[PDB]
Write a protein that binds this ligand. Structure first.
Ligand SMILES: [NH3+]CCc1ccccc1
Ligand SMILES: [NH3+]CCc1ccccc1
Ligand SMILES: [Cu+2]
Ligand SMILES: [Cu+2]
Ligand code: NA
Ligand code: NA
Lengths: 620, 620
């Protein structure tokens, strides 16, 4: 019944029927993105109109289209031819992954470079990498992928252990044309294998680990209704899924007594970028927007009970469209469970004799995606005390190169002859805020040090200051760990019992932001990543911090174009965009498969409640 | 058999016998600290000499003594009269807590102030607070506590809800003399109660929480031998306990193949300080060194199964001395268990078809202590992948005051009329390092941004630089979150298979350090807290960053005096001291009992191993 319900296979089949009938789904067409649109502001007209947005690619070289469709009214709402030289290319198609290796396999320049290295072309895997926008004028308006080669010694070999350095090719995947092959020199292909299931590398497996059994004999404390509506420990929300963004959280609210109090209207990871810091011409173009270019949701893993998710697990199996409009189920793609989280509150009082201990718990909503060598887990946490936390877990295999003789300032050595270029993994969280409603504002809070003197005779005082961000042009903010800088989202029209505005405080990890030179192509395309915090006024069409068509866009779209409007954000419907990321200098211990590293952020209540909201938690 | 075994009740009884016989334990004497000394460098003489250090107080006003005793040889090794005007007072005695309230109860000035407020003296609790060193010349060489008053409406009432502001007294606990009573004005005593077990405040308890059952059907994966030696998942260590520091970790090592490789020789929280930022004369002197002044280990809680520690718990029950030298068991004072920790490593490979998932786990060693209104949990974590992490969990009841009419820049309002002064909780971790042995060095690692130009034509390159700290005078370091600053402890004489020195990287949280004015008394007494990282050359007598006698010491002892020696630390036996802390602006949600907040640090292997050390972990 809910307008925020997951798309169903039936809805997908209708969209495919509608597109076919209208002549928009010919055998040269491919669906490159399909997703449900969120209800517009003012859904209190309960006239549900389930609408879908579709990007349609044309493998014959015709212009792609953006199409909005109403499943409710069986009609095509709008259909727009796209000039991709202007507004950017469509996302990489899954079927294009193989095409790069196959086209290079018959190219004489490619075969020439492989033969000079005594490599059998049948052993050479080619990674299909997004191209970016650089100096090659012939690429404007064309659908280009770049290829880097790895050797597989046998079909179960890990190809990442055997990079072929000094060699890169550019491919036009529509006209099927290898446009350039660059061979800057021969590097030895690193010889050692990286097969982490080979007993010769693992040694004998441990026998010392004894089982941990986590069970809920009475079932879990949360309920799921309508497919994707969660109620757990006063929290209420809807779990959505989008093929670009992955898990999306809607209508996050907290039942405080009788009132259902909104907190966040929509929470997602709206973009993520991985820039490489190796200046070698073989790799200096390498940056991928896993979310905007590849669509992380469509590579979500099926999560196994007992391995990926442990305990009493409830699964969601989201439905997406394949390239032809058929629905495909991602079986067990979202794991949902509660976890014990230690002590929540504890005190033994000398004067009253009361001994008091309460335990904490958290609700976990997670998925995993795999794009090439990278593997990422996305975790949302809801805690008893009102805290919301996001955590990204990065694992998989690092992207490799040759380690150059005589070393490198921009590459780590992982094994003899084998290197791993320096890089970052940078995320953009989009938080469409709704603290007790839609009239919200953001204050920047800094610790204030005070000088010894009148009024502060012993030199012990310290304070804090808050600065309201009133317009978009002043709402691009940087971290300052040294002054304890945080940001508070409050509702100036909703006060707690002390007559102060209710609020939530955003605590960032204060990791470095984008390191690339501000004049670089990547700094222009990933401008969001150069600052920790942006606040915009809400608008229907401002969904992604990089714009709608990231692949081969020349830059500037998204956040820097939005904030130029300089709209009022002081007590308005606002959106917080938080940049956070990992700077990865690979270590030996990351090889041949990488232990998880993490990054994230959290939001804690700041005078949102009238006292601690967990006074009614019982003893264990 | 191990020299690092916990002190036994029998050893304590011998110490009491030895002291008595020597005339050092008369009925005017009180033991203010008793602890085992660590074996000296060069314990390869296996001539175990179990030695104890004792601080002896004299309630009659005579000079206290420091005494070293050999339980092995039944002899007093040394005994030193202390001039406390010079080297500081002995730690607060537990029996002195009540003495402040009892002495004030008969003082006419005190009774006068209470009667003006219509307070029944029988209802008024007095917190015994350490005094510090300020402007009162008559306090030098005297044992002074300061008292702040709270009202208990009935014996089970939470007194923290009813601070009596505008009133403070100073007390000499040896001569039993109220030296000053200061009454700066009357404030209403806040009326609301803060009784978090009162159904009228909690409302009806939740019935929605269903149980989480954590069990180990085959028992835990770790073994304990010799009372306190742990072996778990290639980790080996000894768990010690000291009445000042609490849980101490000795001989942390990792079994890498056949070799037992040392990592850390001794790890402890060696000091912790809570400075208050309220400039009011009633509280502007308030700072407590919970570790150095009060001794956190002697207030360790007994931890309840299912409430404090959940799962398959192994307990240690450490033995300390009471004020007369009798042994007392802290029943179940240390909890020890392993926890599941999510995904350790995961990859699904497009080219090989291999799907690979492994789960992580961690070994937890924890205790809780309670000093007055504050409650703190200390958690050490050991992970499968070689990571070591410390986490402090802060809870209990916030320290309260009146909220002044017309507001405050240095106090938060928690309830009508009730305030909570701004403060910090700052910890000092002392890491006596032993990365593959005792020849260690520290490098500071900063990210390096590179300019677009020759060699970096696309402006994408970035790098890192490492700076060796060679002498103590250059080994006082500050955080820089903006440049990703970390510190690496390496052994330049031990190389991995890539011929690079083995190392561990320290990742800090980059929270603000001491905020007080550098000319303040607290900045002098807690100088360690003004910088994030100190490195010293190891020395037997350099145990605490504030020195041995913190109570009423005038400042400068500890770290700033140690590093003045300017010793060589480049490939030597070194000690890392890491300052980290929480800056607490109390919120409504912290009242009437505070949800846990956390801070900590972690160390990760940095080319310590020759590849990932968890390749031999099995599938679940
Ligand atoms: N993360 C997307 C880049 C990528 C895509 C496919 C193979 C290897 C790398
Ligand atoms: N943390 C030590 C300060 C303290 C001691 C006893 C009661 C209240 C406060
Ligand atoms: Cu990485
Ligand atoms: Cu605090
Ligand atoms: Na909003
Ligand atoms: Na050392």
């Amino acid at each position: 019944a809910s307008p925020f319900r997951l798309a169903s296979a039936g809805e997908i089949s209708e969209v495919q029927g509608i597109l076919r009938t209208a002549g928009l789904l010919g055998p040269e067409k491919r669906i490159a993105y399909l997703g449900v649109l969120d209800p517009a502001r003012g859904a209190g007209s309960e006239a549900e109109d389930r609408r879908f947005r579709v990007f349609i690619h044309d493998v014959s070289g015709a212009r792609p289209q953006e199409v909005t469709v109403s499943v409710t009214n069986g009609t095509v709402i709008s259909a727009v031819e796209l000039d991709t030289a202007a507004t950017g290319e469509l996302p990489v198609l899954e079927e294009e992954f193989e095409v790069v290796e196959q086209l290079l396999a018959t190219d004489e320049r490619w075969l020439k470079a492989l033969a000079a290295r005594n490599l059998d072309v049948s052993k050479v895997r080619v990674a299909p990498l997004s191209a970016g926008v650089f100096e090659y004028a012939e690429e404007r308006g064309r659908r280009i992928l770049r290829g880097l080669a790895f050797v597989q010694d046998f079909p179960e070999d890990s190809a990442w252990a055997h990079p072929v350095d000094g060699l890169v090719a550019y491919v036009d995947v529509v006209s099927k044309e290898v446009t350039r092959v660059i061979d800057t020199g021969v590097f030895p292909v690193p010889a050692e294998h990286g097969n982490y299931t080979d007993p010769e590398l693992t040694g004998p497996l441990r026998t010392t680990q004894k089982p941990i059994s986590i069970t809920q004999p009475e079932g879990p404390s949360f309920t799921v209704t309508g497919g994707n509506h969660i109620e757990w420990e006063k929290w209420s929300l809807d779990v959505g899924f989008d093929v670009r963004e992955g898990v999306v959280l809607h209508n996050i609210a907290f039942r405080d007594g009788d009132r259902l109090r909104p907190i966040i209207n929509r929470a997602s990871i709206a973009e993520m970028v991985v820039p490489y810091g190796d200046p070698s011409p073989i790799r200096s173009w390498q940056n991928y927007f896993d979310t905007g270019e590849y669509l992380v949701g469509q590579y979500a893993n099926s999560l196994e009970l007992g391995c990926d998710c442990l305990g009493d697990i409830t699964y969601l199996s989201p439905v997406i469209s394949d390239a032809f409009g058929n629905p495909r189920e991602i079986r067990n793609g979202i794991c949902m469970h509660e976890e014990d989280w230690g002590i929540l509150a504890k005190h033994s009082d000398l004067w009253s004799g009361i001994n008091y201990t309460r335990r904490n718990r958290r609700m976990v909503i997670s998925f995993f995606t795999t794009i090439g060598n990278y593997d990422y887990g996305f975790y949302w946490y809801l805690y008893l005390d009102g805290t919301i936390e996001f955590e990204a877990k990065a694992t998989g295999v690092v992207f490799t190169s040759a380690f150059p003789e005589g070393g490198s300032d921009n590459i780590s050595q992982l094994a003899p002859g084998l290197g791993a270029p320096f890089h970052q993994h940078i995320f953009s969280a989009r938080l469409d805020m709704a603290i007790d409603g839609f009239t919200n504002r953001v204050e920047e809070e800094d610790v204030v040090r005070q000088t010894m003197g009148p009024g502060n005779e012993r030199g012990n005082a310290f304070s804090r200051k808050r600065t309201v961000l009133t317009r978009e042009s002043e709402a691009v903010r940087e971290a300052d760990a040294r002054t304890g800088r945080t940001w508070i989202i409050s509702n100036p029209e909703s006060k707690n019992r002390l007559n102060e505005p209710v609020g939530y405080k955003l605590h960032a990890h204060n990791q470095p932001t984008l390191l690339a030179d501000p004049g670089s192509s990547i700094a222009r395309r990933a401008a969001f990543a150069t600052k920790d915090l942006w606040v915009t006024r809400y608008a229907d069409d401002e969904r992604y911090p990089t714009g709608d068509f990231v692949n081969q866009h020349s830059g500037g779209a998204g956040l820097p174009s939005y904030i130029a409007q300089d709209r009022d954000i002081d007590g308005q419907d606002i959106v917080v965009w938080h940049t956070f990321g990992l700077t990865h200098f690979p270590r030996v211990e990351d090889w041949p498969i990488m232990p998880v590293d993490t990054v994230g952020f959290k939001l804690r209540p700041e005078g949102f409640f009238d006292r601690s909201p967990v006074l009614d938690v019982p003893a264990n």
